Structure formats: C-alpha cells, structure tokens
Amino acid sequence: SFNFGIGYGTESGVSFQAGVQQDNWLGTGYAVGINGTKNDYQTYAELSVTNPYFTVDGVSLGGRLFYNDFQADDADLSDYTNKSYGTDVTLGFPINEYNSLRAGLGYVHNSLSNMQPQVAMWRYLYSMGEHPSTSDQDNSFKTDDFTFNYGWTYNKLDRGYFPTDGSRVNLTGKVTIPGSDNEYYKVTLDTATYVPIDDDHKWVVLGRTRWGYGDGLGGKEMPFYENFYAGGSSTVRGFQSNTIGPKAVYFPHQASNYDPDYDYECATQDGAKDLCKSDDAVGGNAMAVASLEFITPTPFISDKYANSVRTSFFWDMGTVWDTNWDSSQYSGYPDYSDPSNIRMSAGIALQWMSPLGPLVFSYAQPFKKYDGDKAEQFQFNI
Amino acid sequence: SFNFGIGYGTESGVSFQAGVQQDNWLGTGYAVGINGTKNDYQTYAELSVTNPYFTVDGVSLGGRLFYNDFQADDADLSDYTNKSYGTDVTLGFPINEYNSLRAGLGYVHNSLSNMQPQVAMWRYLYSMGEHPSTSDQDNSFKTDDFTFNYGWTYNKLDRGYFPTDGSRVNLTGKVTIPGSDNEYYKVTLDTATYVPIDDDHKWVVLGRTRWGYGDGLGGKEMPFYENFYAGGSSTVRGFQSNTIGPKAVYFPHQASNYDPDYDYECATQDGAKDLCKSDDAVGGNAMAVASLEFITPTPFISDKYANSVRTSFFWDMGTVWDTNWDSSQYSGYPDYSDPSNIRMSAGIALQWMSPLGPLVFSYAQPFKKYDGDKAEQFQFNI
Amino acid sequence: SFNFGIGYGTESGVSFQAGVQQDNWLGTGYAVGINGTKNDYQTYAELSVTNPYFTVDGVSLGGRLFYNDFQADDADLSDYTNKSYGTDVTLGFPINEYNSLRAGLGYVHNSLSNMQPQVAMWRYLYSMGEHPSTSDQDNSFKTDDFTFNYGWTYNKLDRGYFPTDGSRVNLTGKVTIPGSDNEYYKVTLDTATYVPIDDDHKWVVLGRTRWGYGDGLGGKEMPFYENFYAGGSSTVRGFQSNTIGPKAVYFPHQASNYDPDYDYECATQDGAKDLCKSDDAVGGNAMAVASLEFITPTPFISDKYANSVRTSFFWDMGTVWDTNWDSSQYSGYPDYSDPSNIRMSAGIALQWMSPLGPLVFSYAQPFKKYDGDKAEQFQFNI
Amino acid sequence: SFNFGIGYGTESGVSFQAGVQQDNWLGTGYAVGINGTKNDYQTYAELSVTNPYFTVDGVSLGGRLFYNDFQADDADLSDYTNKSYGTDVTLGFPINEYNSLRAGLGYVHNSLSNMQPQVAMWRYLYSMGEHPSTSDQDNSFKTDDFTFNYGWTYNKLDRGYFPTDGSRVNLTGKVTIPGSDNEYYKVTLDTATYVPIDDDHKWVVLGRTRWGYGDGLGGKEMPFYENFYAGGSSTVRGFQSNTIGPKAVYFPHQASNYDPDYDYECATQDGAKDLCKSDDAVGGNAMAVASLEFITPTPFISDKYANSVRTSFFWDMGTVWDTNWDSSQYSGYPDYSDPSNIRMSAGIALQWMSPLGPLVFSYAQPFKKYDGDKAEQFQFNI
Amino acid sequence: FGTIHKRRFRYWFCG
Amino acid sequence: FGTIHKRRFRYWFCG
Amino acid sequence: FGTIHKRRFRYWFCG
Amino acid sequence: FGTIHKRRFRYWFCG
C-alpha cells in the first residue's frame, strides 16, 4: 500500500507521515507493513512482518518492531519526555474454522524524563520503589518489560464485509514473565453480536461491548503506559478520543520550561499551594463499554449501490476507572475508583466504505456526562 | 485396592493408615482413590477421582480434595501447628500419542499457629506484610491461595514396564491467579533418558535430572510450604529423605511448650542470646539434581525370572538453595543462596518388583556432603 | 568541703562520688569547688574557680571546666552514647546593693553515638542538615558550640537564710555567637516573692514561678541537650524528677544491643511496624511553672529551736512543651505543642536545715496529671 | 520650629512639606515635633511628644505616632502601593552621667498592594506562608507587628557641639513580642571615636563605624521593610543615598499599569522570559560600614570665626548583604550573601554649621565600586 | 496524552 | 518437617 | 524605594 | 535521660 505527507503548521509539527504495505496474493509468502510519523513532538515508526504459511497446517507467525519517541518541546528537552521501543513475536493457530488462538512474547523499553507530578502516576512510581519529589520536574524512570501475550478469537458471522448475523469475540491478554521490571497482568475482551431482524437482513440489531481489566502483581501497580482510555469513534462516540475516565490531579510544583505568557496547571510560579483538579485524562486500569446499534436501511439511497453503505441509530455507554485510587486520602476530590460513573451518548451513524476501507461518519451528543469530559459531537474514522 | 493399619508406639502415633482404590477395567468410568493417616501428630486424608473418558476424544478430567492437619503436641495445642486443605481439578489432553498436556485450577487453605521463629520463614512473613515478634511463639497466619496449574508430558520410551530406550520428560507448573493471598510461580521438570548399550538391551545407561525453580511476584516471597526438598530414594539416595539443602537458623525465643528435661534450639530459657545454626532442613525455592545409573545384568540371578528384577551402579548429584537468602546480613553463617554446594553420592541399587509395584532397594554412601546433612546409607521405597 | 562514696550494686554502677570545696574567709582569694561521679554508665567531673576580688570595685570573675561521659552499656559501647565537655568564664558586676549583672562566654562540645530514633530528636537533626536513617541505631553527631551568657539578679529580701519579705528575681540567658555549630537562644527566669502575713513574720505567703523559652535561629531547631525538664522537689513536686512534659515517640528500628530477655520500645525484632508512644520524657523548648506556698508555724515544735525549721502547705502548677511539634503530621498522637496541659499537685512540706544546708522534705499527690507522667509522692532534696 | 513648602513639578509631586517644633526651656514640660510631606506619590505625617521630667529622677518618656502612604501612580492605584502607620512609646533612664538606657514598645501596620515580583521579597513572602504568583502584579499583603525596643547610649566626648576627644556609642535593638505577624530581631550599633592630635585640638582623627544585623525567628525571614541601606552623606559618601548593597532581580511578569512609551524591568509585554538583573537597590539584613576622617584646620579661613566650620580628609568603607540569599539556586547571578563586596570611597568634606544646625558639604569619588551602584560625587546634608 | 505548551495543546502518543 | 519435642523427633507432614 | 514609571524614577519613601 | 536496658531503667545524666 501507499501514503505520504509532510507539513506546514497544523497544530502538530513537521508531520512526515507514511502508511505502506508490501504484500502478495500467493507465492513468496511475506506480508510487510510500515507506519511512520515525524513531528516536532513525536517520532513514531512501526515495522511489521507476517508469514501466513509458517507450516503446512496453515499456522502463521507474525512479528513487529517499533520506536516511539515523544518530546514535549522542540530545542530544550528538559520537559516531559517519553521514549519507548520494543518488539513482539507471535504464533497463530487455527483449529476450528470459526476459531484461532494466539501465543507470543513481547519486550518493551520505556524511558521517562521530567514528568509532571500528579497523584496516580506517582502512586505507581511509589509502588515501584521510586520516590521522586512532587515539588519539581527533576525526575526520571527507565524500565525493561518482558511479557507473554495470548489470545483467542471466534469469528462465526456469516459474511465479513458487512455482517448480518452471528458474533465476533476477541479475548487478548498479557502476563509479565519473570525478569521484567514491571510486573502486571491485563485482559481485554471485545464482543460483537449481530441479530438479523427481517428475512432479507436489511434491518439488523448489533449489541457490542468492550471489557478491560488489569493490575500489578504482589503490590506493584499496573504501569501507567498500559492504562485503558475510552471515548471516540471506536468506543463511545460523542466524546473526544480517549478523554473518558479519571483525570489528572497535579501536585503544586515548579515547572521546568516556564513562560508566564502561557498556561499551566498547579505551577508553583503561578501561586499554587494545594493540589488542583484538571481536564487532563490519564486513563485507568479498568474499563467497560457497551453499545446498541439499530442498523436500518438508508432513509433515501437506492439499493443497488447500498451494498457499500450502512446506517444506524445507536446509543453507547462507557466507563473507565482506577481500582487503586484512594477514596479516603482525597476526600473532597472525585472518586475515580467508582465504576458507576457511566457516560452515555446517543446518535446516528453512517458506516460508508471508501474503495480502500470502511469509513464511519457519525453524529452523537453525550447526555450522561461528567466534569472534565470533552465533547466531540461530530465524528469520523476509518 | 487395599490397605489398613493402626498402632501403639511407633515413634509416630496411633497410625491409622489406609490406601484404597475403587476402579474398573471398562464400563462405568470412575477411577477413585483414597489415602488416610491418623497419628497423635497428624491427620491426613486425600480423596481423588478421575474420568478417563470425559469426551469422545479420549480427554480425561481429574479432581481431588485433601485435608492435612499437623499438631506438634497432643493435648495442649499452643505449639507449632500447621493445618491445610484444598482442592484440585484438571483436564488432560492427548494430542500426539507420545504426548499429553494438562491444565487445571487449584485452591489451598493454610493455617499456621505458634511457629518457631527462624530467619527464612520470617523473611517470607515480613515479605507478606506480616511482622511477628521473633521473641516468642505467639504468632499465627492464615492464607487462601488460588492457582492455575499446567503441564506437558512426553513419554516415548519403547516399553513402560522396565524401560530400555527413549525418554520420559515431564514439565509441571503453577501460577497464582489474581485473588489469592500468596502470589507465586513455580516450575518442576523431570527428565529421564534410557540409552541401550547392547543389541539385547540387557545393559542400559540411564541419565536423569530434576529441576525446580519458583519465586514470588512483585516483591512477595515464595510460600514456604511450596519449597523444594531433596534427598532420599526418589532424588539423591545416601541422604535422609528431604534433608538436603538450607537449614533453619533460629532466633532466640521463649518456647511455648517447654520442659527442661527435653531438648530445644535457641530457647531463651536455655540461655540463648544469639541466633544459632541447626540441623533442621527447611528446603529452598530452587533445586537441581541429576543421576547417572549404569543398568547391568544381575550378577547372580537367572534370566527366566529376571524380567522382574533390575540392577544398577549409580551416582547421584543434587543441590537445593534459597535465592533470597541475604549472604551479607549473616556474614559468619553459611550462604544458602549459593548453588554450588552440590552433594554427591554413589552406590548400588536393585529395582525389584513386588506383585503390586516396583520396589527399589539401594545402598549408597554420600561422599560430597555438608554440615547438617543426615546420612541414610540403606534405602528402600516403592 | 568534703564528701566521698563508692559502691557494690545499687541500680547505678561503681558510684565513685565526691563533692569538695577549697575556700577562704579572707586573704588569698581563691574559691575552688570540685564534683565527681563515676558509674558503669557515667563519668562526670566538674571543676570550678572564682575570684570574688577581681578588682577594687568588688567585681568577681568565675570560671569552670566540665567533662560528662555517658555510655548506656559499656563493655560493648555501640549503644546510645553521649559525651560532653566544655568551659565557662563569666564576670559579675554589682551596681545596686540589691542587684548584680553577669556576662560571660562558654564553649560546649557534644558527641553522640547510636541514638535511638525518635521524632523530636530527629526533627532537630533534620533541621541541622543531618539525615540519619530511622531504621537502625547506626548514627552519630558531633558539635562545637560557643555562646554568650548573660544575666541579672535582684535580691531584695530582708534576710537570706529563711526569707520573710521581699523578692528574689533571677534572669539568665544564652545566645550562640557566630562560629558555633548550633545556633540558638535561651532565657530562664526564676521569681520568688515572700509576703509576711503577721507582724512577727511567722506566717508568710510565698508566690514562685519559673519561666523558660528558647529556640533555634534561622530555621535550626534548639539543641535537644538544652531542653527544659520539669518535675521534682525543685519545680513541681509529686512527680518524678524531670519527667513532666513531652514524651518520646520512637520509630520502629533495629536495636543495636538486643537481648530478647529484656524490654524494648518499638524494636523491629519485637514486631514493631508503626511508631509507638512511650513514657520516656525528653523535655521541651518551653516551660512555665508556678507555686503558692502558705508558710505556717510548725504544728507541734517549740519556738526557740524553730529557727532551723519551716512548714508550708503548697500548690504547684507546671507545664513543658515543644513549640515545633507538628500537631498535623501525627494526628492520633498527643499535641506536645499545646501549653495548656498544665499539671497540678498539692501537699505539705517541711523545709528543715541540716548543719551544712537546708533540706526540703515534702509529701504531695498530683491531681492534674497526664498519661506517661510518673508520680513521686514522697520527696526529699537539699 | 518652622518650615513650609508646596510645589508644581520638581520630579516629585505637590510637595506640601513641614517641619515644626513646639517646645520650652523650662516649665510646662512638653516637647512636641511634627513632620509632614504630601506628594502625588506619598503622604507622610509624623507626630512626636516627649516629657523630659517624667519623674523626679530626671527620667524621660517619649512617644510618637506616624502615617506613611505611598502610591506609585495616583489616579489608578492598581500599582505598587505601600501604606504604613504605627506608634512608639519609650522610657529613657539616665544612670551614669555618661550613659542612658532606653526601653519601650512599638506597633506597626503595613499594607502592600500589587508589588512587582522579585526574588528577595518573594523569598520573604514564601517564608511567611504566602504564595503569590510571580507572573503578575495581582498580589497583596497585610501585617500587624508588635515589638520591644531597647537601647544603650554612651556619650563621653568632652564637648558636644564639635567633638574633640572621646567616644559616642549607641546600641539600639528590636525583638518582636508574641502576637505579631512578623517575628524578627534587629540590632544597630553606631560608634564614633575622636582622638586629638595636637595639644590645642585643632587636628583630630575620627574613627567611625556602623554595624547592623537582624533576622527572622523560627524559619521566618526578616521583614523587607526593616532592611539596611547604605550610601550617602550619613554612611558612605560618593554613592547615591541608600543604593549600596543587594539589587532586585525580577521575575518576568505582566505589569499592571503598562505603557509601551515608558521603561520597564522584566515586563512580559516587552518580551521577558528569564529573570533579569537590575539597578534597583532593595537593601539587606546585614550591614557594616566604617570611616576614617582626618580633621584638619581649614586651609584658608581665619580662626575666630572657624568655631563654626570643620574640614576633613576622609575615606569610607561599607557593605550590605542578604544572609538568606541562595548562592546556588541563582548560579550565574551575583552572590548577594557575600560580605566581602566592600565598597570604598575617599574625598574631602566641610562640616559647616547653619545658624540652625550643622551642615556637611562633601566631595568624594568611589573607587571600589560594583555593578548597579550609583555614584553621587557631590554631597550635601544637614 | 502529552501536554505541549508552545501550541496550547495536548498531544496523543500512546497509540 | 515439624519438630515434636516429646519424642525427640522431626515429623514429616508436607507430603 | 518605590519605582514610579511615568517619571522614569525610583522614589524613596521608607524614611 | 539515657535508657539502659540491662537494669530496666532510665538514667539521668544531663545535669
């Protein structure tokens, strides 16, 4: 496949961007993919390979190697900086024609510099045996993680292009193998169920849910870079992408790259003494979302090009929470450990299809919403 | 099957004992086994069931339920007391005719009262967040554990009755599932390799090894009741059963059931101020043993009845150690974290066979031995 | 003067003791005094000289040199050890016949080894820029202090062995001179007022008060060895000597000279995890005591020999507190910064007079008392 | 006495000014003085009374009441504004004919609005528990202070109009009494020593020194409005009045009353990002100055009218510093805690005498000078 | 999210 | 092993 | 000293 | 006060 971009000044930076696939239909075997993105504030590069015929049985072997370097400035460094890289290798086993299992190993390196002091991150750091200040941005951290990844996928829906009956279930999980700096476990389960409502399967009802849980082992916290985020086209639309859930509360501190002409949160050179609540989403260790979509015929398109279009009336529900948030130590501050802060939105959606992939347009308005949540009533994604 | 016993004054107590099997060759399916042992100082009861045809594929399902109550006195309690019970359920999958896999779930409850203060146990207790005294036997502990058990067995030796060529490999492992009080992982691997040396397979060479490793997760220690012990007929013969490895070093303390006419270790009413080394074996979290046996024809028996007898010249090697032993805090005390304290014995053995099972007689003498190790030069077991 | 003592076992140690004075009525001028005390746990030696005729004006010059070495064991050392020595020199100026002023310089060296971790001491140590552990008795400290001492004494009571009317006021103070390790200021004010109640001055009313305040300069704490202690014959009788006021709260730690047959406070080898409150008095930086004594004729002694005896019914009040105690960091622990924890006792007293000095017998019972205070209802002192 | 003035544009404002004394030679006792000054930017009013025969002993009692309101604009307020008022009462005790002592009580109220952010002021504010922004002039402060003032003056120079032999020493000090918002101590010592050099006392040598030290108590800083300033006719001439010593370094901030046609320091609407050094003197908490004057006969004036004139060749030394300036936090910025930045000037002076008071003309040129110091080579004062 | 100040914006980089 | 004193013996119960 | 800007000058008022 | 343990006692030495 094929893409490219660079840039002026779109809020983001230089904006080198690329999505590429080198592939075959039959004969030499390799399936190769490449993603790239360079900004003033990020350098992301992902290289992926897969052999779908690792052996006669049809079993597949897939690996990938990634680099992801984020810098919150442009010449100084010395501000919040998050570099990551790593590798994955996995085996995929078909058994039943409906099913597949997956097992593999992964390694991830994470380097942090000058992270802004906030409660949740620093609860985790304290749990790891690290005690940074909470009064300044002079801190750092560095971890090597090794994980065993597994999964099971069930895909008995009668047709794959635009489903009409049956279910797709996907369970994927991680457990740290001994030797890693972080020690955690994680599970994520996607479920989708299509029930046809007329004999021609032009009206359908889709139920859908995402579940996610995870935690640290033996007294460690789950690494913050593995948190769950909700909101957007993929989960609960009507909200800004990945903004649902716990928000950061910051300790009063001296910011490292300060400029009084700009805006800061609990900066000590703005007069901050107490900790203060913010809009900044930080995700959690637990997540549950659901969605009911009534798929209907298009309210005025013709039927012989409609095989590329789908229309639905939906309502989405979703919540993200942090199990280890101390509801007692921060009495006047909202309980981010409560699961019942369920956001809810409803709207209309149009699952179109570009010649190279399905596209979801949608409008929604969130009606069950909480403070700090950012609304995004008009949504588009691939 | 069949057994029974009672007693009067073994060294041990009342000695109610039973081993029983209710079984079938074909037809109704159940395989049931029962073990029982009542003494003045122990009550052990194990009930086991297995269905070898859980489904058409030949897959098996096996479960068991056990109770094991140890009291170091008979009328007072108030002394070292260790009660345990629990349950296991497992599924066994054949795939290759040589192979099988196993996966299951287990639960174990452990109650401790008045355990005598010693370093290793109390390092573990400290690691669990428990801080008992070290000056008295007034302590207790109580844990509920849940585990996922797995295993893989490979059994391609040409005949099973008395092997002559090929190998038997068994890997079995445990990982605590979230929700358990203890959090640990464990692996145990037995390997046996028979190589025939003449065309008639009357002289054979057997290599054999046991490996065992395990640890706690996230800063917890491995539970002491899951430690590895070596020595005896099953592992390294020439030593007393399960006496190889780390020994207990006790803190000076007031014993709870004291009598000056009897013998005690670092009892404060015997004048103890420092901690003192002992013979008491306590096992470790890591273990490695090996054995080379030259199987030979019997030096004076006829060949017509020799199909029930086997003779070998062997040497056994073995070591057990505690990875989390602090070699610095106890400078003048032996390093129980060193793997290289390898015990070694050599001798002759006669694998006979009673009409109901194989019996190993053996003589050995340990020549590489360390302080506190107890010798048992004349060995017998089933 | 004259005294001597040694010993065999009387709770304290060897008990070499001496109080001596080499003096004159007129002539050669010197006034010399010597005090000595050797125990298993202390060696105290004080040498003092004074010239009451430093110049024609009657001005005096007085100096002293002292050594004071405390060891809490001492075949081992390695336990709480406090050595001190130093020197004082002062000038005394009469001006009004009622009055005198005093000005001088002092130097004090203090060495500390293996002090047991407790909050107040370690707040001071933290304030001095020293950060010892709080988990063990492996610590030390060493300071050289230089001070300017001053004072004013007013003594207009009509007769001096047994006062009957008028007041004695004494103000004494210290300020560290630049160059000293510690930096502090201190003031102590004693006030006594006799008011005669009959024309013969056989019934009198005595009001009395002690005030003491002190603190560190520029963010340092007042040295712990300069704290105020109250209780006993000299201050508030009915309490054990110097036991009134703040008590030590200890951090859980490993004691350096441990023996399970003996008693310890928040020792980690006794199972201590939290900090724990104790009876151990440690004094404070502020103090206020008062006393009202009704001096009466003796209820059954004749009047000619009564010129050596005095009887009183009294009322003592007193409090000691630590200004820099954090009432917030230790919420469930008593507020040692509150001044209003005023202890109060009442009783009867008999100011006798040995041929070499006045002796106070007394009985009292403390009726306003707080936890940790030790009662001493029967009191004697010179 | 007598004075008056008004104005229209002198650099300063309206310039209402008055100095007045209502007095007596004998009888009715009162001694009254009044000072007043009204500008566009200040309103200063001081009223003083004294009774020199408060009692038969010749002891005096003196009090005063003052108001001092400074506004850096007029019509807007909203800029740096400093209002103060208060009261003093004191007793003066003669004892020796050379000497006097003084003891009294004072109260001072200080209100601050919209002070420009600079390091030293805001170190003090932080020390008081106040945390203003450092990014804007939206701030305020308000304090009530109570102080005990004391002093001792020694004045044994043989004649008082124009000294010729002997010394004048003055020690004056302050300590905050409990209940005041600020908590500080301060001492100021002036010493002057005349040594005659010929038998007629027409050539004299004058040594002179000023010392000043002060600090906050228990971790508070000394109030900025009590700082020491040096330079000018009274101290070290050749410099502009009160300009010697530490200079303000400002934080980048938004000025409250801005006009781009005028000049500003580290204003954020002039492009300021870092903190910047300035000429603005702010004084310090410590000060030491000295002066050696060779008093000579006038190089051409006749001797009987010379009893109203004096001539000298002098050199002055002086330094002012801030003890609590962090020499580490501001590495590239000058160390205002160093005492050794001693300014030095030399010149000639003519102590004349108007019919109502002595007048000092002088010329000097500072030869040991540092950056930011402002020179004033031609000096006049009463 | 990673907050960058010189564009008044929060940057997503975790995916 | 569990040490019982009144028989001068160490008792195995972990299996 | 109190800085007044509209006359480019520092004004002494503490005495 | 200086705590000595082998006599279960607190020893006064500051005076």
**Which is nearest to C167 in space by CA: C186, C148, C154, C150?**
C154
Q: Indicate which of C269, C275, C276 best probes the interface with B, i.e. most B CBs within 10 Å of its own CB.
A: C269
**Contact, A364 vs A237, CB < 8 A?**
yes
Q: What does each C-alpha distance from D366 to D230, D239, D248, D314, D378 come to in angstroms?
A: 13, 7, 22, 12, 11
What SS3 class is residue B120? Answer: helix
Instruction: Answer positive or negative: Cα dihedral of C179, C185, C187, C188.
Output: negative
CB pairs < 8 Å spanning A and E: 49
Torsion sign across C-alpha atoms B172, B178, B179, B180: positive
Residues of chain G with a following break (C to N over 2.5 Å): none
Q: C–D contact (≥3 CB pairs within 8 Å)?
A: yes
Q: Are C150 and C169 in contact (CB under 8 A)?
A: no
The closest of A100, A40, A112 to A72, measured between CA atoms, is: A40
* Distance (Å) of CA B123 to CA B129, B137, C122, C252: 10, 16, 28, 17
Reported structure resolution in angstroms: 2.8
Neighbours, chain G (3 or more CB pairs < 8 A): D
Taking contacts as CB-CB distances below 8 angstroms, the residues of chain C near B253 are 260
Topology of the domain comprising D72-381? Porin (2.40.160)
CB within 8 Å: D133 and A271: yes
Cα C82 to Cα H14: distance, rounded to the nearest angstrom: 10
Q: What DSSP character marks residue B308?
A: G
In degrees and rounded to multiples of 5, residue C267 shows phi and psi of: -80, 135
Residue linked to tokens 């409560």: A338
Q: Which of A260, A269, A273 has its CB closest to that of D254?
A: A260
How would you classify the pairing of strands A204-216 and A286-296? antiparallel
* A223 DSSP β-pair partners: none
B15: left (phi over 0), alpha (psi -120 to 50) or beta: left
CB–CB contact B135 C259 (8 Å): no
Distance of CA A178 to the CA centre of its chain: 26
What is the rounded distance in angstroms from the CA atom of residue C51 to the CA atom of residue C29? 6
* Cβ(D325)–Cβ(D337) below 8 Å: yes
Residue that the structure tokens 């491995």 belong to: B222
SS3 of residue A111 by DSSP:
strand
Which residue does chain E place closest to A81, by CA atoms?
A: E2
Q: Which residue of A has its CA nearest to B127?
A: A218
Among candidates H1, H5, H14 on the partner chain, residue whose Cβ is nearest the Cβ of C263 = H5
- State the virtual CA torsion across A296, A302, A306, A312 in degrees, nearest 10: -20
List alpha helices for chain C, DSSP H.
Answer: 119-127
CB contact under 8 A, D11 and G7: yes
The answer, yes or no, to whether G and D have at least 3 beta-carbon pairs within 8 Å is yes
Instruction: Transcribe A166-235 into DSSP letters.
Output: EEEEEEEEEEEPTT-SS-EEEEEEEEEEEEE-STTS-SEEEEEEEEEEEEESTTPPPPGGG-B-B-STTS
CA dihedral angle for residue C247, residue C248, residue C252, residue C257, rounded to 10 degrees: -120
Q: What is the dihedral of CA C263, C264, C266, C269, to 10 degrees?
A: -80
Instruction: Provide the chain F residues 1-15 that lie in CB contact (below 8 A) with chain B.
Output: 1-14
- Cross-chain Cβ contact A260/D136 below 8 Å: yes
* Nearest-Cα residue of chain D relative to residue C323: D218
**Whose CA is closest to B230, among B207, B205, B208, B211?**
B211
Which residues have a Cβ under 8 Å from the Cβ of C10 and sit 6 or more positions away? Answer: none
Q: Quick one: tokens of C273? A: 């995890």
HSE value, Cβ hemisphere, 13 Å, CA-based, for D68:
20
* A373: helix, strand or coil: coil
Q: Give a three-class secondary structure readout of chain D.
A: CCCCECCCCCCCCCCEEEEEEECCCCCCCCEEEEEEEECCCEEEEEEEEEECCCCCCCCEEEEEEEEEEEECCCCCCCCCEEEEEEEEEEEEEECCCCEEEEEEEEEEEEEEECCCCEHHHHHHHHHCCCCCCCCECCCEEEEEEEEEEEEEEEEEECCCCCCCCEEEEEEEEEEECCCCCCCEEEEEEEEEEEEECCCCCCCEEEEEEEEEEEEEECCCCCCHHHCECECCCCCCCEECCCCECCEEEECCEECCCCCCCCCCCCEHHHCCCCCEEEEEECCECEEEEEEEEEEECCCCCCCCHHHHCEEEEEEEEEEEECCCCCCCCCCCCCCCCCCCCCEEEEEEEEEEEECCEEEEEEEEEEEECCCCCCEECEEEEC
Question: Is residue A372 within 8 Å of residue A247, measured between CB atoms?
Answer: yes
Question: Are H5 and C257 a contacting pair, CB within 8 Å?
Answer: yes
What spatial distance separates the first Cα and last Cα of chain F, rounded to whole Å? Answer: 10
Which residue of E1, E5, E6 is in closest CB contact with A280?
E1
Separation of alpha carbons D338 and D321, rounded Å: 7
Give the residue extent of every domain in chain C: 1-71, 76-381
Q: CA A217 → CA A184, A221, D118, distances in Å?
A: 5, 7, 49
Distance of CA D376 to the CA centre of its chain: 17
**Cα D371–D373–D374 angle (5° rounding)?**
135
Distance from CA of F2 to the nearest CA of B (A): 7
CB B62 within 8 A of CB B49: yes
- Closest chain D residue to the Cα of C324, Cα to Cα: D218
The amino acid present at C225, given as its one-letter code, is Y
Separation CA D184–CA C185 (nearest Å): 13
Which segments within B266-342 are labelled E, that is strand?
Answer: 276-281, 286-296, 310-321
Of the candidates C234, C191, C194, which has an alpha carbon nearest to the alpha carbon of residue C382?
A: C234
If one counts every other C-beta atom within 10 angstroms of the C-beta of residue A127, the result is 16
Token pair in block for residue C67: 């050594």
**Spatial CA neighbour of C296 closest among C197, C378, C162, C193:** C197
Q: How far apart are CA H10 and CA A188, in angstroms?
A: 62
Q: Which residue of G has its CA nearest to D45?
A: G15
**Beta partners for C378?**
C363
Two structure tokens written together for A291: 């969605």
Which amino acid, C279? D
Question: How far is the C-alpha of C176 from the C-alpha of C172, rounded, in Å?
Answer: 14
Buried b (16+ CB within 10 A) or exposed e, B281-300: bbbbbbbbbbbbbebeeeee
Q: Residue B122 belongs to what H/E stretch?
A: helix B119-127
Q: How far is CA D13 from the centre of its chain?
A: 22
Look at the alpha carbons of C342, C348, C351, C352 in this order and tell me if their dihedral is positive or negative. Answer: negative
C117: DSSP letter: P
* φ, ψ for residue D224, nearest 5 deg: -65, -25
- Measured between CA atoms, how close is C118 to chain H, in angstroms? 13
Method: X-ray
Token representation of residue B46: 């194990």
State whether residue A300 is helix, strand or coil.
coil
- Is residue C335 classed as helix, strand or coil in its secondary structure? coil
Q: How far is CA D40 from CA A256, C28, D9, G4, in A?
A: 42, 75, 10, 11
The CATH classification number of C76-381 equals 2.40.160.50
Partners of C71 in beta bridges: C81
